[PDB]
Amino acid sequence: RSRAEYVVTKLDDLINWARRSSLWPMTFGLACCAVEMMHMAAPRYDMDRFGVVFRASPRQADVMIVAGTLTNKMAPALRKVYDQMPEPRYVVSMGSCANGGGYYHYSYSVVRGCDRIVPVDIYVPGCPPTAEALLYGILQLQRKIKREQKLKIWYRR
């Protein structure tokens, strides 16, 4: 192909590498799944070693880890915090509650999945899914945002 598209592809590689190497989350943590989140933060799995910084503010956050049961009383707060997060933002839903309501699916005060409120990038299944599996979801997110070609789309505009 053209020489300019090669440079554009390499620039996409650099930008995607930066975004997946420096992935700062805030965990909108509610429950059991947030406990298992901090077990992934724990020294065995070491997302800080992976480049993923524990306890970041929503202003400095890249991905929101929806960890727990999203209730009707909490969904406006979830949407507000998601709106306060800057534009390059991803969503990792974790657990059956945040995925599709889970064990409280037929409840009067439980939102059937956080995808009804925020656009979810990756769903992590389990109740709770292990910290091993959540770290799998994070690495899958890094691969997914490695697959992005934003300057390639812009050049092909």
Partner: protein, 39 residues
């Protein structure tokens, strides 16, 4: 001397004579705190 430009004045008194923080503690996150502070 009450004139039109000074008749609205009143004599001085003989003796010459709570706004608080309504903070919302929260996403440090499933806890809401309406917290009433004096400084």
């Amino acid at each position: 001397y009450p004139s039109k430009e000074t008749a609205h004045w009143k004599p001085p008194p003989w003796n010459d004579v709570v706004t608080n923080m309504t903070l919302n503690f929260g996403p440090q996150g499933v806890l809401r705190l309406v917290l009433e502070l004096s400084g």
